[PDB]
């Protein structure tokens, strides 16, 4: 829209107001769009007894494909955008610009895998807020999409060959970050809430939970055409906008189908004091701010 020259701008994608603002707008939307039969939130104000707050309401079944949402500048501010084909989110960017709104973003709620997102324009790209810290999330962005086909009848499908090529590119990128002599190893999730241990996502209004062990079980730099993930649909859900629980009614349709493109991943690295040289990576996620950061890394909002 409006380009700039002879101007340097320091970005910091791990300290971005747009990410927080978007997180609330999204919550508000899901909150009001898909309503639970019962809502449970903890309330422990009193020093002693804890009081669970309960809400019961009419819960109509609803399903439609999330419409792209845009972020636009609030009165007083402006949106700068970095145009470097491969920008890591931090430091100066001279190929900068100012825009009305951001690009169209699908407000997808999911873990482990990022769906229907933006692709890297050149090579596969990995990004973190602190790589040496094994607790911080590693966001992968792919340069090629991978289909994942899911059905309410209990499974998801991925082509093995396509997924294997993808793993090769991530491992390649990973070992470049942690030492060119390291062995890259993908393992299943190590534990936690169901929404975190499985590849969790929403589809036709129903919450799916898919065992992703088969996607994360290989060793790099040391047979069956499609990979079929077992899945469950669930009625009792852990909240993601805050701490609590939600119950929905059982499905009313017998033909729930989701085709999606895997455009990125969320990983966590094992780490830990080990003179043995090999890094272990497991699927991660849970904080949707990471999901939003993978789309907004190239934006910042500045006062006019």
């Amino acid at each position: 829209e409006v380009v700039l020259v002879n101007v340097t701008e320091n970005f910091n994608w791990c300290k971005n107001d747009m990410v927080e603002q978007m997180h609330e707008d999204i919550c508000s939307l899901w909150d009001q769009s898909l309503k639970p039969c019962v809502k449970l939130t903890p309330l422990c104000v009193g020093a002693g007894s804890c009081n669970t707050s309960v809400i019961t309401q009419a819960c109509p079944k609803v399903s439609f494909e999330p419409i792209p949402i845009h972020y636009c500048a609030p009165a007083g501010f402006a949106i700068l955008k970095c145009n470097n084909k491969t920008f890591n989110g931090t430091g100066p960017c001279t190929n900068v610009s100012t825009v009305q709104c951001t690009h169209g973003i699908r407000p997808v709620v999911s873990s482990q895998l990022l769906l229907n997102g933006s692709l890297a324009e050149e090579e596969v790209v990995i990004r973190s807020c602190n790589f040496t810290d094994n607790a911080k999330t590693i966001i992968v962005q792919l340069n090629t999409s991978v289909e994942i086909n899911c059905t309410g009848a209990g499974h998801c499908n991925i082509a093995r060959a396509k997924w294997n090529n993808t793993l090769k590119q991530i491992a390649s990128k990973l070992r470049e970050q942690f030492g060119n002599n390291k062995t890259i190893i993908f393992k299943q999730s190590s534990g936690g809430d169901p929404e975190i241990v499985t590849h969790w996502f929403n589809c036709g209004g129903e919450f799916f939970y898919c065992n992703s062990t088969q996607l994360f079980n290989s060793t790099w730099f040391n047979g069956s055409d499609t990979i079929t993930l077992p899945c469950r649909i669930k009625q009792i859900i852990n909240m993601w906008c805050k701490v609590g629980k939600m119950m929905y009614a059982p499905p009313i349709s017998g033909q729930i189908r989701c085709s999606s493109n895997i455009t990125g991943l969320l990983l966590t690295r094992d780490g830990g004091n080990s003179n043995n040289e090999s890094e272990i990576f497991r699927p991660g996620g849970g904080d949707m701010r990471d999901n939003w950061r993978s789309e907004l890394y190239k934006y910042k909002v500045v006062k006019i």
Partner: antibody, heavy 128, light 110 residues
């Protein structure tokens, strides 16, 4: 296949309160929802309320609301009904019932409204 | 609230013949409808649920049908142990305000 066994008959003065219990055994307790239904001599069945055992959430009939409470003690597979401010018209046989809801501890929950397993009933007489 | 009303109050059937009970609702309850059987001094017993599904242990001669605001229960060949009071229930609404019909007494015709 659960077996429901209720406590003994009660006799109360009007204005009193009552707490009837129901022991469930044979199956995984948190996979069942439980309901209380009463019946007055010569009358029909009346739904009083229902507890979602795994969430610990209960719902009641509008005409009882405010003076009835259903709870559940997981450590002893026991369901309780409390009825406050008793009246002579509360005289009834009080039935405890329940039904399987699915693998609730794994997030599967059907929310069945029907009643498959019944206790033997507890007579509660309310008189001066 | 949703009112359930059964007809008739009393139904006199000769042994071994067919009986037909009806349950009517004051508004649609879809297929969230169950029938119960009760004998003097005993707890009720679930017969049918979802409008038309027999519960475990229930003999084939019992069968229910209907949807919305209109339901029937059929016993194709009355045995001695079939004569009792029958109750229908709806459990469609949310928050739950489930309700019962006043019952149909099924007695022997002689």
């Amino acid at each position: 296949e659960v077996q429901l066994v209720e406590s003994g008959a009660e006799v109360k003065k009007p204005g009193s309160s009552v707490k009837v219990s129901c022991k469930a055994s044979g199956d995984t307790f948190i996979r069942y929802s439980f309901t209380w239904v009463r019946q007055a001599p010569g009358q029909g069945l009346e739904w009083m309320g229902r507890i979602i055992t795994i969430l610990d959430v209960a719902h009641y009939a509008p005409h009882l609301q405010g003076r009835v409470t259903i709870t559940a003690d997981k450590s002893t597979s026991t369901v309780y009904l409390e009825l406050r401010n008793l009246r002579s018209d509360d005289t009834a046989v009080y039935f405890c019932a329940g039904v399987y809801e699915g693998e609730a501890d794994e997030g599967e929950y059907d929310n069945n409204g029907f009643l498959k397993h019944w206790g033997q009933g507890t007579l509660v007489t309310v008189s001066s | 609230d949703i009112v359930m009303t059964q007809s008739p109050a009393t139904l006199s059937v000769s042994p071994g013949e067919r009986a037909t009970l009806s349950c009517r609702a004051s508004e649609s309850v879809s297929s969230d409808l169950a029938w119960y059987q009760q004998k003097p001094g005993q707890a009720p017993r679930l017969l049918i649920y979802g409008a038309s599904t027999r519960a475990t242990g229930v003999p084939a001669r019992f069968s229910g049908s209907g949807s919305g605001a209109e339901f029937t229960l059929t016993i194709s060949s009355l045995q001695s142990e079939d004569f009792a009071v029958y109750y229908c229930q709806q459990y469609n609404n949310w928050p739950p305000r489930y309700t019962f019909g006043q019952g149909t007494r099924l007695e022997i015709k002689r």
